[PDB]
Amino acid sequence: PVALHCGKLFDARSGRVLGPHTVVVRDGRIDQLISGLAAVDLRNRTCLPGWTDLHVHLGGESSPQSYSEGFRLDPIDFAYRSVGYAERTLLAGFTSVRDLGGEVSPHLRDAVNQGLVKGPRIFAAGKSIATTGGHADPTNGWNDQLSHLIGPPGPTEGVVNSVDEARQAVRQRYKDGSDVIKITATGGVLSYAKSGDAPQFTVDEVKAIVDTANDYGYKVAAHAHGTEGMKRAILGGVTSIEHGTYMTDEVMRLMKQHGTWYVPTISAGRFVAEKAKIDGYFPEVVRPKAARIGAQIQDTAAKAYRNGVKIAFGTDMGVGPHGDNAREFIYMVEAGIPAATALQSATVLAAEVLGVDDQGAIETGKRADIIAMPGDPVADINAVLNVDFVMKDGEIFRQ
Amino acid sequence: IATTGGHADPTNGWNDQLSHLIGPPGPTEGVVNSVDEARQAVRQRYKDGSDVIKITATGGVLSYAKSGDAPQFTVDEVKAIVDTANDYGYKVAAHAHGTEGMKRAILGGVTSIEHGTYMTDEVMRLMKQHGTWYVP
Amino acid sequence: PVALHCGKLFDARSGRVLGPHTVVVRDGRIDQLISGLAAVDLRNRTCLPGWTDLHVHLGGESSPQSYSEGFRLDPIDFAYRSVGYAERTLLAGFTSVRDLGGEVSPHLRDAVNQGLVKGPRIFAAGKSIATTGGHADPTNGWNDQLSHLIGPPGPTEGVVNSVDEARQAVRQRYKDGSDVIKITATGGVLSYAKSGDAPQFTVDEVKAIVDTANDYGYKVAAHAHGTEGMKRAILGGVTSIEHGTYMTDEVMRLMKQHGTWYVPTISAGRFVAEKAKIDGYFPEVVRPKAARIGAQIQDTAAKAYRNGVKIAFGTDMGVGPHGDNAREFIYMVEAGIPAATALQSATVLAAEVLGVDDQGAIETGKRADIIAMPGDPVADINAVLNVDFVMKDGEIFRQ
Amino acid sequence: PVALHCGKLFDARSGRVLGPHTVVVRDGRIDQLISGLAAVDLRNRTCLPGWTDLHVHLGGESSPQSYSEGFRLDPIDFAYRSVGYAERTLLAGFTSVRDLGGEVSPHLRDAVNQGLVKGPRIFAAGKSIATTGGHADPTNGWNDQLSHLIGPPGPTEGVVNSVDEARQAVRQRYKDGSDVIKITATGGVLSYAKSGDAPQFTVDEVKAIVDTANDYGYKVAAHAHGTEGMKRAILGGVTSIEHGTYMTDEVMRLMKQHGTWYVPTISAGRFVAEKAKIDGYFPEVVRPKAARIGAQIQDTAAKAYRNGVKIAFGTDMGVGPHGDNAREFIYMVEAGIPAATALQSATVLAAEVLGVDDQGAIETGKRADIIAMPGDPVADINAVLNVDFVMKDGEIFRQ
Ligand SMILES: [Zn+2]
Ligand SMILES: [Zn+2]
Ligand SMILES: [Zn+2]
Ligand SMILES: [Zn+2]
Ligand SMILES: [Zn+2]
Ligand SMILES: [Zn+2]
Ligand SMILES: [Zn+2]
Structure with a gap:
């Protein structure tokens, strides 16, 4: 039971910054919202709900050695790194994240929920589903000896080639606790493969995956760069698109007609664009794709916002360093999206994307996830980099 | 007979080492994911002397799994199982708790329902129209 | 930067031999074509674009021991032989080839592209796709012990039996770098199997392969001898037919209506026809098929040319000795095809078959692949056997 | 660079508590020891070197569910628990430990050394070596299906049955980074086996293990309860004995003649003795062995101290809760060992057992591992439970 006294409160639903307020927290939820017992003095700060990052990879981080550590390290070492990654992410103001790949995050989520380590609320995807030779095929770039020893991946490993295999893969993700x-849907940048935008899913496989996920109560996020794969994913019925690098007008019309969410992840594009200039950082099969794709992300986000596509907050953390998730707000504002809309995309629109109704705004009966900063983020978006108060589930982690 | 991760999957709750050692279950072990696999599973039950x-049809209580009423069978797999069992002279009993899985089992043509915890009025109408038995 | 002065130039697009010309090459492309700085004196020669062979197997060569070396040798020895094969092929005037089978050619192509060894520009198919017991099944003729040890081949090994397996096989070829x-499509001559013209593919599997290849940007070449398999391949949508031994009038009508290319490979038929007369050269299961099929190739080529079927240049090297690819011109001319058309089928029509637009003719902006011979090949087709100048990518390999 | 001012200093080599001293630490070592710049005020505390626990298992902790979690959990979850275990162990005053079993501790040691997590200096044993059906056989108690699926363990898994297998097992421990x-040497209490004191090693296998370890620079610690196995381990040439529950006079004579160290681990015996009274805590095969063996440890320690056997500090943490390692001092003092000797057994005698010379005492040139407590541990041994200052490698973790 703690009472919070803060000078300004940001109302996520309305998008306006209000005046002084008092928030009473008992049992981990918001109970009273008096406008105009333990006490915390935040009267020189602005009150905001905790932020949600809809695209992170807490199980790793990009480095010059990232393409050789896989054959020498074990997932235990990556878990030991993920401890610090999760702590840094939580302390930056992000009280919940959506993990979109990696088999260490379901375990990190369990550890955080049991209180063993500090971190945000994790919604984990587990192993990503791809086709043979696809962006998420786990044996791309292996030699003949290793490939023969491991065998060809199947639905249990996340590689599908038909409707029944897609059904089995979704059921296996359910069995693993996703x-x-x-x-x-298409090729990518960081994979050890040749193509980066070619369509790698048929519409029948996407429809089977979506139907199976709807049976088990899941939502589907699709990685796409090329136009044809993006259109196939949209027509199959996916919930959100993770990259839209080559989005055309017909794709935007389909997204508006279907109601598909768009997650730009500008930070990853900028990071790969700058890292491609360094010599030897990326493998020679990866470098051209990065140098070509990373530069066509911010203009796409501006065009999508101008055309009325629904946009949600995501950074593709992992490619970049964990703990710097809030610079995406600055990139969004410099891409033409207003500061209030950029802030809303990470609190209430993110809750809509996740499919939950117990978070996203400072309202009675919702989870007590509250952050504070000395400045006013709407007037100056640069204030998002100075967060000094963090509260998750009624427990204070930073003051 | 169940589906992958279903109430009767024999490797639910096993760790990675044991799961890799045993491998993923298939129709021989009672785990099906398509029409042909359902046919093969019924034929394997016949081969074992059933x-x-x-x-x-749905999740359960005693399994080492998360869900307990979600629909885990498609109507096409239930129809394939029922047709194959009718060829070999068998009857089909379905375990169900949730409404959707119970309705899929009834529309597939099963003989009896083993639990009906969340039976609604529409399910009772379908059971009366089809003649399905109920075992509480 | 080198200027080429040659007495006569063959214009591939028009099919006519022109007079004196000067070709300026900088950065590996053709820049100027003055009609009427380093200099090469070719004023007593005829200028031609580099030739393309659309059907070779650079990973081996036929021999009396070819049916027993497979169980005793490794692909490394075949690579050491392929070094000489590729050098001999390049020095004969063939600056590009299309390899239609063998798992050593993707590696030879990489080595040639990196400059480690000398050779032409290689477009490799990797493992050929067949059905169980088909012409390209890798375990035909094995005994029970070896068959049980290796197991039954599947889509990863190139053996398909359904639509989904065909999709997975095409995706695996993409994963291996094809x-x-x-x-x-049908049986063959050199396989350790009984049939040689029976249809071994259903039209639904061919349609699935073609659709999957179209998704990934590939073209499809089909090996066929019998009429039914050839018709199924044509109706499925393949790009070219590799043999047409039993082509009927209805097949030619379908090829003309669809626009299918025809590659006769007369050299292989002649070679097997002569080798079948020798006793013990071929296994007793292979000898009748060779003796029956090798004699029905030149008449088919003449009939196809008479009926208006589009014809492209290919030799099926490997069956014959590498380095003698230019005798196919003589065979084509003696089959009734004019010398100019035979020369065009290996330069511009071959580029159309390959799907590229940066080669095939001596025009500004195209790759600098140039060959020269003392005689005039149009007046006397026998001049193609004396090539003394070879240029690939602006680099001179023979003078 | 920090100067430490503390009222009393315990000299580990002499075993006496001196007066005021000043310790200067630069670059992580002790540089000056002025008797009678950053400053830390400890003038109301007693200065001691950091403690070493020679027998811990940081990869787990005993619980009512410990005999079923093995089939359901992965080593990643145990690593997430080990993070807290290691932090609690370090904060209690133990700056170094010797881990004597478990495959998570080599990875935890790497993570602590890289600074990812907080913990003490870890000397890890990796997998323990046993014979078929022995105390450390990893498949004891498994059913027929699981045993057939995993196969019979060999030297790679730590199970040996001959001289050559023992050599290979030691070399495999070296390969895994031990x-x-x-x-x-004998059976144990916590294993899922019938016997608990029977000799399970021949003297020839012990001699082979010791010779192989001497080649690679290792020391050998032996777990033993029965007399015959303990005598075989001593005659083979092991460095220390981990339990001595049934030590006779002839065994003590052999230990004195050879110079073998003795680690009693009284805490584990007491813990299992009390836990055996609870119904259902232990499996029915484990309960009689625990109830019989746990009560015969303190008297053995008293007799060993009376007879002149060299004694070193160890607790067998893991069986008991991590963080309560300092209660072993109280048990040792109540077993008749003087407080000064009990304190020496964990600082300088522990360094002798470990085989290092850069720690164990507050002397110039040694590692800066310093702890402090308000009371005087020699006058009152109960003061060891209140540690408020911890320093490891010149870095302060608690003040
Ligand atoms: Zn992505
Ligand atoms: Zn991503
Ligand atoms: Zn039941
Ligand atoms: Zn052929
Ligand atoms: Zn061929
Ligand atoms: Zn022990
Ligand atoms: Zn122990």
Whole structure:
């Protein structure tokens, strides 16, 4: 039981900054919202709900050695790194995240929920589902000896080639304890493969995945760069698109007609664009794709906002360093999206994307996830980089 | 007979080492994911010397799994199981708790329902129209 | 930067031999074509674009021991032989080839592209796709012990039996780094199997392979001898037919209506026809098929040319000795095809078959692949056997 | 660079508490020891070197569910628990430990050394070496199906049955990155086996293990309860004995003649003795062995101290709760060992057992591992439970 006294409160639903308020928290939820017992003095701060990042990979981080550590390290070492990754992410103001790939995050989520380590609320996808040779095929780039020893991946490993295999793959993700489904509709940048925008899913496989996920209560997020794969994913019925690098007008019309969410992840594009200039950082099969794709992301986000496409907050953390998730707000504002809309995309629109109704705004009966900063983020978006108060589930982690 | 991760999947709750050692279950072990696999599973039950067929249409209580009433069978797989069992002279009993899985089992043509915890009025109408038996 | 002065130039697009010309090459492309700085004196020669062979197997060569070396040798020895094969092929005037089978050619192509060894520009198919017991099944003729040890081949090994398996096989060819797809629609001559013209593919499997290849940007070449398999391949939508031994009038009508290319490979038929007369050269299961099929190739080519079927240049090297690819011109001319048309089928029509637009003719902006011979090949087709100048990518390999 | 001012200093080598001293620490080592710049005020505390626990298992902790979690959990979850275990152990005053079993501790040691997580200096044994059906056989108690699926363990898994297999097992421990060797000479209490004191090693296998370890620079610690196995381990040449529950006079004579160290681990015996009274806590095969063995440990320690056997500090943490390692001092003092000797057994005698010379005492040139408590531990041994200052490698973790 703690009473919070803060000078300004940001109303996520309305998008306006109000005046002084008092928030009473008992049992981990918001109970009273008096406008105009333990006490915390935040009268020189602005009150905001906790932020949600809809695209992170807490199981790793990009490095010059990232393409050779896989054959030498074990997932235990990656878990030991993920401890610090999760702590840094939580302390930056992000009280919940959506993990879209990696088999260490279901375990990190369990550890955080049991209180063993500090972190945000994790919605984990587990293994991503791809086709043979696809962006998420786990044996791309292996030699003949290793490939023969491991064998060809199947639905248990996340590689599908037909409707029945897609059904079995979704059921295996359910068996492994996932909260959300992730597929790679097209090729990517960071994979050890040749193509980066070619369509790698048929519409019948996407429809089968979506139907199976709807039976089990899941939502589907699709990774896409090319136009044809993006259109196939949209027509199959996916919930959100994770990249839209080559979005055309016909794709935007389909997204508006279907109600598909768009997650730009500008930070990853900028990071790969700058890292491609360095010599030797990326493998020679990866470098051209990065240098070509990373530069066509911010203009796409501006065009999508101008055309009326619904936009949600995501950074593709992992490619970039964990703990710097709030610079995406600055990128969004410099891409033409207003500061209030950019803030809303990470609180209430993110809750709509996740499919939950117990978070996203400071309202009675909702989870007590509250952050504070000395400045006013609407007037100056640069204030999002100075967060000094963090509260998750009624427990204070930073003051 | 169940589906992957279903109420009767024999490797639910096992760790990675044991799961890799045993491998993923298939129709021989009672885990099906398509029409042909359902046919093969019924034929394997006949080969092992069974007198009756049992499927888990939904999740359950005693399994080491998260859900307990979600629909885990498609109507096409239930129809395939029922047709194959009718060829070999078997009857089909279905375990169900949730409404959707119970309705899919009834529309597929099962003989009896083993639990009806969340039976609604529409389910009772379908049971009366089809003649399905109820075992509480 | 080198200027080429040659007495006569063959214009591939028009099919006529022109007079004196000067070709300026900088950065590996053709820049100027002055009609009427380093200099090469070719004023007593005829200028031609580099030739393309659309059907070779650079990973081996036929021999009396070819049916027993497979169980005793490794692909490394075949690579050491392929070094000489590729050098001999390049020095004969063939600056590009299309490899239609063998798992050593994707590696030879990489080595040639990196400059480690000398050779032409290779478009490799990788493993050919067949059905169980088909012409390209890798375990035909094995005993029970070896068959049980290896197991039954599947889509990863190139053996398909359904639509989904065909999709997975094309995706596996993409994963292994192929440039083109090859299937065996019917039986063949050199396989350790009984039939040699029976239809071994259903039209639904061919349609699935073609659709999957179109998704990934590939073209499909089909090996066929019998009429029914050839018709199924044509109706499925393949790009070219690799043999047409029993082509009927209805097949020619379908090829003309669809626009299918025809590659006769007369050299292989002649070679097997002569080798079948020798006793013990071929296994007793292979000898009748060779002796029956090798004699029905030249008449088919003449009939196809008379009926208006589009014809492209290919030799099926490997069956014959590498380095003698230019005798196919003589065979084509003696089959009734004019010398100019025979020369065009290997330069511009071959580029159309390959699907590229940066080669095939001596025009500004195209790759600098140039060959020269003392005689005039149009007046006397026998001049193609004396090539003394070879240029590939602006680099001179023979003078 | 920090100067430490503390009222009393315990000299580990002499065993006496001196007066005021000033310790200067630069670069992580002790540089000056002025008797009679950043400053830390400890003038109301007693200065001691950091403690070493020679027998811990940081990869787990005993619980009512410990005999069923193995089939359901993965080592990643145990690593997430080990993070808290290691932090609690470090904060209690133990700056170094010797881990004598478990495959999570080599990874935890790497993570602590890289600074990812907080913990003490870990000397890890990796997998313990046993014989078929021995105390450390990893498949004891498994059913027929699981045993057939995993196969029979060999030297790679730590199970040996001959001289050559023992050599290979020691070499495999070296390959996995171990710092010390651990064998189970007899049966134990916590294993899912029938016997608990029967000799399970021949003297020839012990001699082979010791010779191989001497080649690679390792020391050998042996787990033993029965007399015959303990005598075989001593005659084989092991460095220390981990339990001595049934030590006779002839065994003590052999230990004194050879110079073998003795680690009693009284805490584990007391813990199992009390837990055996609870119904259902232990499996029915484990309960009689625990109830019989746990009560015969303190008298053995008293007799060993009376007879002149060298004694070193160890607790067998894991069986008991991590963080309560300092109660072993109280047990040792109540067993008749003087407080000064009990304190020395964990600082300088522990360094002798470990085989290092850069720690164990507050002397110039040694590692800066310093702890402090308000009371005087020699006058009152109960003061060891209140540690408020911890320093490891010159870095302060508690003040
Ligand atoms: Zn992505
Ligand atoms: Zn991503
Ligand atoms: Zn039941
Ligand atoms: Zn052929
Ligand atoms: Zn061929
Ligand atoms: Zn022990
Ligand atoms: Zn122990």
